[PDB]
Amino acid sequence: NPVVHFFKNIVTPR
Amino acid sequence: ENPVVHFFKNIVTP
Amino acid sequence: TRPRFLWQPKRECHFFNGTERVRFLDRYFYNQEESVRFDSDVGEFRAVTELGRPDAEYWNSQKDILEQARAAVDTYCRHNYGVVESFTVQRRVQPKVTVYPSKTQPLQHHNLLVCSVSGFYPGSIEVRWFLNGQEEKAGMVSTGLIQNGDWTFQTLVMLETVPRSGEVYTCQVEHPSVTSPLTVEWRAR
Amino acid sequence: TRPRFLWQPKRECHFFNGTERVRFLDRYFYNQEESVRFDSDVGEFRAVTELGRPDAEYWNSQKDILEQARAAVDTYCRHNYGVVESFTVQRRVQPKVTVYPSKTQPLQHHNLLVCSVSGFYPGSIEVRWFLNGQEEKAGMVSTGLIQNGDWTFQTLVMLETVPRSGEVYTCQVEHPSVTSPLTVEWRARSE
Amino acid sequence: KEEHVIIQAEFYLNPDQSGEFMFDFDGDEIFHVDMAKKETVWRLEEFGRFASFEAQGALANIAVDKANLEIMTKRSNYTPITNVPPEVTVLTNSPVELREPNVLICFIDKFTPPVVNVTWLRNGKPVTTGVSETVFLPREDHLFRKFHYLPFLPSTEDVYDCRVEHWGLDEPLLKHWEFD
Amino acid sequence: KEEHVIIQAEFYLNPDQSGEFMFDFDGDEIFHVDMAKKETVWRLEEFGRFASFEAQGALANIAVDKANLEIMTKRSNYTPITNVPPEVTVLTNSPVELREPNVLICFIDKFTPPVVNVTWLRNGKPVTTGVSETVFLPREDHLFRKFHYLPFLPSTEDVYDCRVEHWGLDEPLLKHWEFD
Ligand SMILES: *[C@@H]1O[C@H](CO)[C@@H](O)[C@H](O)[C@H]1NC(C)=O
Numbered sequence: 138n139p140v141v142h143f144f145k146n147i148v149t150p151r
Numbered sequence: 152e153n154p155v156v157h158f159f160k161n162i163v164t165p
Numbered sequence: 166t167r168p169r170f171l172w173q174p175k176r177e178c179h180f181f182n183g184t185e186r187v188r189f190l191d192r193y194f195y196n197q198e199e200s201v202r203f204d205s206d207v208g209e210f211r212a213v214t215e216l217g218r219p220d221a222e223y224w225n226s227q228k229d230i231l232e233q234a235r236a237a238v239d240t241y242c243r244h245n246y247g248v249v250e251s252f253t254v255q256r257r258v259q260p261k262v263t264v265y266p267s268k269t270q271p272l273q274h275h276n277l278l279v280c281s282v283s284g285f286y287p288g289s290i291e292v293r294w295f296l297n298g299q300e301e302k303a304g305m306v307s308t309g310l311i312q313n314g315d316w317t318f319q320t321l322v323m324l325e326t327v328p329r330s331g332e333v334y335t336c337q338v339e340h341p342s343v344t345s346p347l348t349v350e351w352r353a354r
Numbered sequence: 355t356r357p358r359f360l361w362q363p364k365r366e367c368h369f370f371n372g373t374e375r376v377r378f379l380d381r382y383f384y385n386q387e388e389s390v391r392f393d394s395d396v397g398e399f400r401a402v403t404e405l406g407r408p409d410a411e412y413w414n415s416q417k418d419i420l421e422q423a424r425a426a427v428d429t430y431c432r433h434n435y436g437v438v439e440s441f442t443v444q445r446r447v448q449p450k451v452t453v454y455p456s457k458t459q460p461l462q463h464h465n466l467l468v469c470s471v472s473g474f475y476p477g478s479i480e481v482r483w484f485l486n487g488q489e490e491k492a493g494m495v496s497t498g499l500i501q502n503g504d505w506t507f508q509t510l511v512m513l514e515t516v517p518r519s520g521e522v523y524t525c526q527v528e529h530p531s532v533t534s535p536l537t538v539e540w541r542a543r544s545e
Numbered sequence: 546k547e548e549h550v551i552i553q554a555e556f557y558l559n560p561d562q563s564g565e566f567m568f569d570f571d572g573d574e575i576f577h578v579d580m581a582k583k584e585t586v587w588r589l590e591e592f593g594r595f596a597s598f599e600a601q602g603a604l605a606n607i608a609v610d611k612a613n614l615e616i617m618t619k620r621s622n623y624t625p626i627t628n629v630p631p632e633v634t635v636l637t638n639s640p641v642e643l644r645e646p647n648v649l650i651c652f653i654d655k656f657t658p659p660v661v662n663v664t665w666l667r668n669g670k671p672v673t674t675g676v677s678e679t680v681f682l683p684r685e686d687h688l689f690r691k692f693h694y695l696p697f698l699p700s701t702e703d704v705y706d707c708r709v710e711h712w713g714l715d716e717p718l719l720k721h722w723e724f725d
Numbered sequence: 726k727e728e729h730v731i732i733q734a735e736f737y738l739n740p741d742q743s744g745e746f747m748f749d750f751d752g753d754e755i756f757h758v759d760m761a762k763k764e765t766v767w768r769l770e771e772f773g774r775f776a777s778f779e780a781q782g783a784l785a786n787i788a789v790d791k792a793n794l795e796i797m798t799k800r801s802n803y804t805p806i807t808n809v810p811p812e813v814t815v816l817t818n819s820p821v822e823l824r825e826p827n828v829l830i831c832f833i834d835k836f837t838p839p840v841v842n843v844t845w846l847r848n849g850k851p852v853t854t855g856v857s858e859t860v861f862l863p864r865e866d867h868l869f870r871k872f873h874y875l876p877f878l879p880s881t882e883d884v885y886d887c888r889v890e891h892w893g894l895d896e897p898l899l900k901h902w903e904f905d
């Protein structure tokens with residue numbers, strides 16, 4: 138039904 | 152004085 | 166046993182006055198040290214511990230990651246609240262009040278009267294004790310709010326009394342799931 | 355009420371195998387965030403949070419503070435350990451044992467046998483329960499070590515039973531302050 | 546002051562190689578994604594009739610975590626987490642009435658890392674009948690919370706114990722419960 | 726493993742302008758310096774007959790603390806501490822037995838900042854006869870600990886309560902105790 142939005146993860150230069 | 156306990160002395164930053 | 170390493174990303178939305186005011190917080194924890202975070206109220210990432218400096222500096226350099234984060238308050242926080250407001254913000258379950266003394270002692274000795282409030286939701290609540298219509302403001306020992314973990318709460322509030330014939334005690338509960346306060350009495354047997 | 359601000363300098367000496375190995379830690383806490391620290395195992399100050407950056411960099415510049423800090427393991431830690439070891443590391447206080455059943459009922463019903471150990475030091479201790487000379491390995495609920503704040507500890511260990519006539523339960527406690535373990539029994543009596 | 550808080554919490558832990566994804570509202574779990582069954586799990590089935598969530602997003606977000614942990618680990622120079630033992634406490638859902646159904650709750654609080662063994666004991670014997678549990682819920686102090694439930698029938702003849710095992714504990718901690 | 730730990734902890738708190746200096750061995754306080762009477766105070770009398778400490782060093786070190794707090798404060802941009810409420814619990818020294826002296830202990834745990842008001846209440850009335858307390862002991866998590874003692878004579882006619890007030894508390898917390 139209505140949708141829950143998740144916060145997309147991103148990597149990190151190492 | 153009995154044997155004495157040494158304390159770590161403090162001094163500051165400007 | 167070998168040592169462990171824990172990475173924990175936590176995004177939290179805080180709401181004031183419905184959704185008139187929202188605050189987003191992108192937090193990151195390494196083991197037990199938060200290393201870097203974005204606070205909508207600030208506008209950019211900040212390193213809490215030197216460990217996050219590399220990321221705070223980088224993520225701050227890229228515009229898309231900054232815009233993504235700055236819009237979060239709307240595109241994420243506000244959206245989601247509207248998606249669950251029905252079964253969370255508006256969820257209401259009525260308390261179940263029971264009054265009883267602990268220890269069945271003869272009259273005129275010291276006693277402890279228990280007001281067991283259970284099964285409710287939300288957790289906001291107000292329990293008060295009265296003796297013959299007059300509010301007792303002292304001698305109350307409470308357990309505080311207890312989260313049962315299944316979307317209901319419970320709490321106990323006791324009053325120390327020295328019961329005398331014909332005294333009538335009353336536990337009055339107040340909760341958003343009830344228009345007029347619930348009450349349950351106990352008469353000095 | 356106005357807001358509060360807390361500055362908390364903490365110096366800790368960790369000893370291993372006596373004084374065979376020591377480690378010093380000069381810690382500094384602002385409110386609830388450690389800001390900067392010195393670890394003898396590293397040799398120099400480091401900033402834990404960006405707040406400590408200024409001092410960690412500064413203090414490292416003055417080769418006079420580094421000396422104080424690097425030598426502390428001897429001039430401070432080991433010294434003090436010698437000054438107190440007699441009344442701390444060597445401290446020994448005998449436990450006081452008492453055995454009793456919570457719930458005074460008629461025999462033959464489930465009960466809880468409590469063994470209370472109080473007033474001992476140091477904290478290392480072993481409590482065991484026996485029924486008719488055989489050690490019971492299940493049904494024991496302990497409260498764990500409780501520090502009374504006055505240089506003594508206490509603990510309680512309960513055993514879950516269903517006492518019957520002629521049964522004798524013994525609580526046995528092992529502690530450095532006692533050469534041969536302590537035991538106190540309780541003869542299954544219907545009360 | 547604030548009115549409500551929604552938190553999207555997740556985590557990855559090595560060497561265990563175990564992760565988790567979940568949403569929390571004012572302290573309660575709305576849902577969490579099952580890593581092995583790759584499907585979203587609501588906390589109360591009703592919730593599922595109002596909202597929805599694509600389980601895939603979670604599984605993906607977890608992989609990015611496994612990767613960033615391996616980076617932060619090295620960057621931390623391999624300093625590990627220090628065990629913090631749990632605060633167990635056993636409770637009862639609703640007040641107790643002999644022979645009328647109820648539920649024993651085992652509250653394991655303020656601990657880390659998120660790895661714990663819990664066993665229900667009835668008269669010394671383990672029990673599995675209808676027992677259930679929740680995933681690791683987060684806390685403000687970067688620590689964890691968890692609940693274990695055991696449905697039972699109150700009586701004067703039984704005693705119960707929740708047995709908790711955690712790396713920050715010297716040995717198994719038992720929490721006792723018995724009708725009084 | 727780790728055998729022992731000695732800790733020299735101190736602190737300064739503004740606005741209150743209150744400080745503290747003490748030594749800790751494996752959790753127990755060895756001594757602390759009385760900021761007002763300017764004299765070192767041994768936790769246990771006997772201790773004094775074994776070592777010594779020049780109270781002056783402490784008062785000097787505190788002065789430096791007051792200064793550094795005023796710097797760190799400004800440098801912090803004036804962000805204050807967030808109150809953390811205590812975990813009160815009342816206990817008894819040794820097992821209770823009718824008509825044999827004893828002592829009630831009031832454990833005030835895991836709280837901050839180091840300010841707390843404690844009152845012993847017997848049958849609702851405050852009590853000062855022989856009560857004693859400890860300074861603020863430190864804890865790993867940068868929080869505090871504290872103990873309050875009340876010698877008393879076991880009886881079935883009385884009831885006690887430890888009343889604790891802390892800024893992180895919504896209101897007075899009462900811990901009850903009574904022989905039965
Ligand atoms: C849980 O039990 C298993 C099996 O004995 C063991 O491998 C593991 O170490 C235990 N976990 C904890 C936290 O004690």
Ligand SMILES: *[C@@H]1O[C@H](CO)[C@@H](O)[C@H](O)[C@H]1NC(C)=O
Nearest residue numbers: 840841842889890891892893
């Ligand atoms: C301690 O008591 C004083 C006097 O009642 C009061 O001003 C203060 O708010 C109390 N402190 C706390 C933390 O409750």
